[PDB]
Amino acid sequence: EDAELLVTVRGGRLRGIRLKTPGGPVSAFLGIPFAEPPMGPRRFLPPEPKQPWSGVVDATTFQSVCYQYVDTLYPGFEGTEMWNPNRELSEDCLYLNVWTPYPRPTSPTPVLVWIYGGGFYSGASSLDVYDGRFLVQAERTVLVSMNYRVGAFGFLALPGSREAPGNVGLLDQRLALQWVQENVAAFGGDPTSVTLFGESAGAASVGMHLLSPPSRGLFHRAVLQSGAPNGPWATVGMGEARRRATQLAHLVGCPNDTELVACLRTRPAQVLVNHEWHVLPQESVFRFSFVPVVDGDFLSDTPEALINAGDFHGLQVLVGVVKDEGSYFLVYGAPGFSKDNESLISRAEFLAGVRVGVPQVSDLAAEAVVLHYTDWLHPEDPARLREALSDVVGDHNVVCPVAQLAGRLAAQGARVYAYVFEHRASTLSWPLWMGVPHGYEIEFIFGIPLDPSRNYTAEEKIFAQRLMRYWANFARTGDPNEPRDPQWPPYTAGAQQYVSLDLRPLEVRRGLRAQACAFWNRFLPKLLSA
Amino acid sequence: EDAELLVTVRGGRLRGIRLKTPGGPVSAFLGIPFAEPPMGPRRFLPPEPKQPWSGVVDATTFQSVCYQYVDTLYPGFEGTEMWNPNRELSEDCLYLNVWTPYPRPTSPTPVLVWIYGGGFYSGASSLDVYDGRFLVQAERTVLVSMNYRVGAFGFLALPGSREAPGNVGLLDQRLALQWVQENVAAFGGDPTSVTLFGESAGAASVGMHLLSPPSRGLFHRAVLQSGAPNGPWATVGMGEARRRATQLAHLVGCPPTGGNDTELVACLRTRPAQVLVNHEWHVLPQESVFRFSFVPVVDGDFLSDTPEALINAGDFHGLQVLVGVVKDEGSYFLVYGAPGFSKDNESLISRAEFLAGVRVGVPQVSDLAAEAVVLHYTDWLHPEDPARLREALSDVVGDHNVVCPVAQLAGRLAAQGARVYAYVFEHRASTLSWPLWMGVPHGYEIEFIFGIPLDPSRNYTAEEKIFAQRLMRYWANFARTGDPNEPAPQWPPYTAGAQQYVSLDLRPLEVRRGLRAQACAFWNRFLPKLLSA
């Protein structure tokens, strides 16, 4: 019997499992209950701490995936299936995972806590691409990841009501962070060195924990990959949250908030999922029905206002983007786009694309977008149009919100490091024109190329190892840099320096699309106001 | 008496003078009356045709400059003085000039007619830089230029009134064009081949003759240099014209505001010209560079709609047009009020001074619109670099007032029938007295067009004499054929799509694309949607 796989946490005893890597074994504890199952009368409610159990919880395999839409755009395509549930769906899904060196550390080891993305409507901690074994073995941290409720189960809100208060998916994450504070030491982890990292809606979630005081005591550093709490998709106002909740009820045959939530609670989970997308105000890409709501509780103001007001002295943050943030999203409803052709679009398609990738803004606003992003010497060239619509979607949704966050944090006391991830994986199954798409730096950060059963090059493995070193350096010290040999300088509102991450050594550059982001961050708000 | 210097025109007999040029003799008839002096009761009225006369009028020197403000910014400085009146000021100023080859052409010769600029508040056909003797000698065209009233005398308008209808300085120009039709043949010119060219407000004036049906019949081709009738400074609406006219009258004691129009104008007419001039700049809405008190008014008469609308709505088949700009249209205007600018230093302005300049150079737009200008013209990787800020403010002023209005005119005309040729003038004259940072400023292509470097009293290089002869050749080629190309690299037409134009400098023609295309999309496409909403 292996005593390295036996662990007692406050609620009871756990039996973990030993995992293999090309670098030696790792201890893993998968499927640890951290909340009471949020089912029946507990749907839409805040998570309750998991009650103590007797006997041994079997933590040798991943647990169920929180109920969510399953992507059917390209059935069986690698590039989409890698994000789909790889366990059975269930509302009984609040479990977290711990990987730790083997044998377990006997001195406090810094903790990395992963929060998955998926637009707040999808995702799981069990995806192959989130496999913690390579990071833990290589950089000897403790790694934790949790499932949190998504879609209406996590974010349906009738503001004011006790029955559906909103943001419970965010509370799921906070409970898991509390859990870590109370129990990570039993695994060799150091609760005083906890670094949050997340991608897309996971990065948005990380920033929201930054801006919400009751979370802020639960971690010490923060990594934001390709997402930001101020992104225009990441939050919704109270009024609009009430309208969307109300339309879901009508769509599934339900009628006073108490009566409304009660009837919603009688419906099978799959029925809510089936209808969730039909509550969005217009046709779009990059917009999601149930998201964090600004209501004074979890978020006392908008993430924007909160970022501007904050004193961020003492904070170290790592943030960045992939080279082509917008391309992936275009195949989900921009006229003329497909992964299976060159997507060489017409000016009229571009024009229609813009109202899809920049939803719910005025005509005048859309015109301003077309002005900035048209090359008026080549207004109708298909290739340039495809690239320009990709820039529109990427800039609006990811790059410029991340740029705004980095500038305001650095200017208000934080130490910020910025990257652009520019390496196209040799194994990438999306077409060439998509470039380096959204989400394809994750497999490198988690060191998936080290898996021999996969087909990365020798150079991609050396690359993964570099990235894993930067990230773990940052978690340990607040500074990704390796000792002087080329150095990764802090990002500042003035010099705006960041580094390129690819097979070549670090290259220092200026401006996260500064010209484009002045448009979105400086001009466009003035316009919508006045 | 010498036969070549005697001509009979419909009004009576004229006597002229023989001019010496480097390349040989020219006949000039300077200071020909074409209107009754718009004096006393005739102030603010349309010009009356000059009554016939007996005996011989001596047309042997330039007549007086129309009453106008005289620039005092840099007194004695060449760069400003070259534009100031070089004859006495008078309201008696409605004379024109004809230069012709010596001896007088045997067969009908193409006519170039010149319309000076000066913001509609200044200018004169007698300026040295408009000396027609070199063009006529080199290219054997007939050259005509006229004086027309400026400032309040030309453009004060109380719309609807009989006593001050407005646009009379444009009517002065039309009368001169009518004069050319009826008389140019007596000088050996061809009234069926008449090409208007003007610079700045003269180019705006040329464009307005295009868009006013009674003018349009008096010429066949058009050349617009650094100016366009759709420029934001070039016209005013009826209500604002009246407001300005009314404020002017008030500021000089008329009446002892508004009231009967006839009484107000009669009181205006009793004021000395110099008094009107002294007060004319106090009627502008805000302080600005590039805005002028009395300019053409859109009132349904001379102009039946705004120049924009008329341009958009027009059929221009059978028309050839040559248009262009200088390399640095805006720089000249900045030393007249933009904070931090002077000809006598580097004008390395601050960010605060740049922002403040955007309001002066783009006057009377909302804060939202100003914000949008700052967005487009700031380099956000270098938001505070003084040199860059200087250059950008020059671009702002240049693009808004000259380049994008011309670009818009060029594109619509191409699209709607006309053959268009476009240039950018890029040579900085060896004699230029303005500082190096101003580059190639507004108006400094003119002296090459008129072949002034051939003047032996001036100290131009030999290459500049060659270059000036090239330019003269293009303009006259265009006037003869509607095509500036030698009937050497070719000058292609301008089109809304390929947007091709040539650079004019000491090097041979180079073909390039887009007249500040990115910048002008902002001014010509987006910004007007902002003003609606």
Ligand SMILES: *[C@@H]1O[C@H](CO[C@@H]2O[C@@H](C)[C@@H](O)[C@@H](O)[C@@H]2O)[C@@H](O[C@@H]2O[C@H](CO)[C@@H](O)[C@H](O)[C@H]2NC(C)=O)[C@H](O)[C@H]1NC(C)=O
């Ligand atoms: C590139 O593909 C898009 C997407 O169309 C889909 O994928 C193709 C590979 C093919 O299998 C189509 O049948 C699919 O519908 C094309 O845009 C579509 O054009 C068809 C024309 O009948 C239209 O009915 C669809 O609505 C369009 N889809 C979208 C999303 O706009 C596009 O035409 C292709 N480019 C080409 C052919 O040059």
Ligand SMILES: *[C@@H]1O[C@H](CO[C@@H]2O[C@@H](C)[C@@H](O)[C@@H](O)[C@@H]2O)[C@@H](O[C@@H]2O[C@H](CO)[C@@H](O)[C@H](O)[C@H]2NC(C)=O)[C@H](O)[C@H]1NC(C)=O
């Ligand atoms: C560059 O010059 C401007 C213009 O000022 C005049 O021209 C100078 C060459 C010199 O002769 C000055 O003495 C003149 O007054 C300067 O802007 C002026 O600055 C003064 C204060 O020092 C102020 O009172 C004026 O209003 C300013 N005028 C404008 C149009 O802004 C400018 O500061 C000079 N830049 C330098 C010297 O670096």
Ligand SMILES: NC(=O)c1cc[n+](COC[n+]2ccccc2/C=N/O)cc1
């Ligand atoms: N009917 C539904 O519940 C539903 C839910 C989610 N989506 C989103 O699927 C597309 N998508 C899938 C993966 C990543 C991004 C995107 C882009 N969305 O805009 C569609 C329908």
Ligand SMILES: NC(=O)c1cc[n+](COC[n+]2ccccc2/C=N/O)cc1
């Ligand atoms: N009548 C007036 O008071 C007056 C004052 C100022 N201005 C314009 O100021 C000079 N200026 C300003 C901008 C460009 C050129 C010039 C040169 N003028 O001759 C005109 C009239």
Ligand SMILES: *[C@@H]1O[C@H](CO)[C@@H](O)[C@H](O)[C@H]1NC(C)=O
């Ligand atoms: C203005 O005064 C004149 C002069 O007596 C007179 O005809 C009338 O009162 C007014 N004229 C017009 C046209 O209104």
